[PDB]
Amino acid sequence: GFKQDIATLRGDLRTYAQDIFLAFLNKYPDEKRNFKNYVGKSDQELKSMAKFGDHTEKVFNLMMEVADRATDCVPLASDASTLVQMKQHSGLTTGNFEKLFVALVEYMRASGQSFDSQSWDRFGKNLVSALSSAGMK
């Protein structure tokens, strides 16, 4: 289930975080625009940069903490608020977050692993309405 998936993901965090983020950026190249330093680079060039790994690991770790704190795949309103208000998410809309979750789910379905891909979809949908409720366009 969903709680075991957090343990799995977390077992090899930096590896999953970069694989999932690459799948997001290649599914939706328009989104790369938000990541000016990553433009013009192949997957392997990105994975060779320390700062790519460091940044994905940090995002993913926070995502796993938000997932951990959820109840039945509904995140806490305060976690959503942390997400809306961080400086770093200044120009974003809820559309950027739903694209991310589509790629996550699609990555999970395609991997070998017994992820509970349906719980992750539902989590992403409930995150997106929580983000809206906390002030995001």
Ligand code: HEM
């Ligand atoms: C639940 C999903 C997400 C979480 C937990 C999250 C969290 C974070 C965190 C913790 C950072 C700062 C990392 C650091 O200090 O190096 C960050 C940065 C950033 N995030 Fe997110 N984020 C999420 C989704 C997104 C999405 C969907 C976008 C855009 C599509 C996005 C765009 C950015 C950008 C552009 C930065 C700045 C990176 C930099 O300037 O180095 N984030 N996010």
